């Protein structure tokens, strides 16, 4: 959160127009003599430009700054632009080349308008009662037909589930979700209580339909499943997930939120890996922990770093490690490009909402992923209360998404 | 246009069409639209849309699909908000049923000739043998887009061919705060970049 303070706190202030950078300085009566300004415009995370430039803006006072002819290119992606203001020397308080602001617009985008080389091979699909095969290559990916999930995958020899990727609609209840709801007194209107009493957290799901196609140069799944909690439909869940030739599996989904339930937390999916890695590369927001309603002080751009990071100790545990706005995640062999929030750790959600501290947590089997398609804000107002403003409430009733797994 | 992509596959109980679009101009694409359609024993076909706006376009005053229906009819009836013309930003008066009415009174005769008549949370339309359903706004009447666009006074528009009908999967707002300068709220703005929407159209 400290994060988030220290740049809704700071204290110039920027504005874009056209290449032009106004800044606005907040102090009263100092002037920036201890600031540089450092520009930068990146094209999904590849650098094509720096700048830098002292700031001589008297408090109160605007400063005005034109950039150089800025490259662009034709390839495709999202051209950001990226300023941060910085203290050369030292204080008594700070650091040489601490960093005290900083400002991100989106110049543009090119579109992709490239459809993918024709597939070499073709998946080959092998039914079965139990289930469908996918094979292509070394790779293998099998449905089980009873429950309508992806129960497991190989690369070559090495399966890479632990647990088969699913719908999952929940969250480990943060601080703020639980109010001051005891077990002893329960406070009804904590979101927690809501969500319990609905059946949200022990929805059983129902195979509606379940079915393998063959397209001309891929293959086709597609499923159905309702959830419900004493014959009430909470949610309905639709996907595809079409397999090529190159070995790529697209994933689209689609919920339908019963109206008169309350808002789920979350909409997404969820599976336990095999595989445990080092690092964690993504292109999106961060490099911290940042929610819907908490991420402006996070930066678009290519984060890498160690697994151990993408968890939050807070001592009392509940969700988190969201990072939001990512656009592609890479986790060892595996690589999912969309739009999507994410999070990834050794812990399952169940895991971290049944336990009391933090020092108990115990490293799971491999690794927890979940992929959201969307998740709900935190709040924060207060923490006695629903702090959630209704903007970051998930209220449409029909949700959207896609994703590409794939390998490299 | 640029058609960069249109596929037919043969589904099992069904035959799927498959699309991509490319809205460009100066070699700058705008938009990006994907569909499905597919089409079942049952005879309806299942439209499915997706589309993608470039960041730096000033956002769309809609997205969805028109085409010039055949048929003339007397009455258009729908499930949703009504009875009368209803607008994102302007729609908190209109309630949702199930509306029946004329033709005529789907548009609305503002002297100076523009977009109008339209009507939101639609879940089903039907005109003659057709019926759609899904989530949508439409409009529908016998003048086209360009007709209200290039007519000064509404004395001059004449009623065309057959039907224009125009679904849409989303529509901005039409502000009013004032009238001139800027006046429609941000949330009411297409900016979102992805957009998705569905429908099936039918017949009785």
């Known amino acids: 959160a400290l994060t988030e ?91 040489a080349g601490h960093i005290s602001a900083w400002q991100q617009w989106r110049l543009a985008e090119n579109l992709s308008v490239t459809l993918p080389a024709a597939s070499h091979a073709i998946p080959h699909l092998t039914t079965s009662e139990m289930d469908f095969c996918i094979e292509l290559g070394n790779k293998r990916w099998q449905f089980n037909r009873q429950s309508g999930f992806l129960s497991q995958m190989w690369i070559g020899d090495k399966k890479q589930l632990l647990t088969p990727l699913r719908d999952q609609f929940t969250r480990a209840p943060l601080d703020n979700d639980i109010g001051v709801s005891e077990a002893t007194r329960i406070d009804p209107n904590a979101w927690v209580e809501r969500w319990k009493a609905a059946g949200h957290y022990q929805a059983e799901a129902a195979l509606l339909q379940c079915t393998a196609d063959t397209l001309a140069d891929a293959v086709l799944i597609t499923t159905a499943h309702a959830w419900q909690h004493q014959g009430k439909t909470l949610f309905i869940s639709r996907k595809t997930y079409r397999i090529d030739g190159s070995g790529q599996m697209a994933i689209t989904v689609d919920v339908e939120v019963a109206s008169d339930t309350p808002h789920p937390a979350r909409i997404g999916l969820n599976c336990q890996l095999a595989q445990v890695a080092e690092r964690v590369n993504w292109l999106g927001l961060g490099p911290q922990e940042n929610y819907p309603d908490r991420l402006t002080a996070a930066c678009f751009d290519r984060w890498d770093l160690p697994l151990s990071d993408m968890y939050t100790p807070y001592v009392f545990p509940s969700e988190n490690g969201l990072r939001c706005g990512t656009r592609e995640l890479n986790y060892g062999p595996h690589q999912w490009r969309g739009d999507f929030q994410f999070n990834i750790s050794r812990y399952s959600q169940q895991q971290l909402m049944e336990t009391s501290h933090r020092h108990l947590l115990h490293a799971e089997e491999g690794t927890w992923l979940n992929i959201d398609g969307f998740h709900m804000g935190i709040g924060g107002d207060d923490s006695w209360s629903p702090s959630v403003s209704a903007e970051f409430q998930l209220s449409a009733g029909r949700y959207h998404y896609q994703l590409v797994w794939c390998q490299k």
């Open 5 to 95: 303070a220290k740049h809704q706190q700071q204290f110039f202030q920027f504005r874009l127009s056209g290449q032009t950078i106004e800044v606005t300085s907040e102090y009263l009566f100092r002037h920036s003599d201890n600031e540089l300004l450092h520009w930068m415009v990146a094209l999904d995370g590849k650098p094509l430009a720096s700048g830098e430039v002292p700031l001589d803006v008297a408090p109160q006072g605007k400063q005005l700054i034109e950039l150089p002819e800025l490259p662009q290119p034709e390839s495709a992606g999202q051209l950001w632009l990226t300023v941060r203001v910085v203290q050369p020397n030292a204080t008594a308080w700070s650091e």
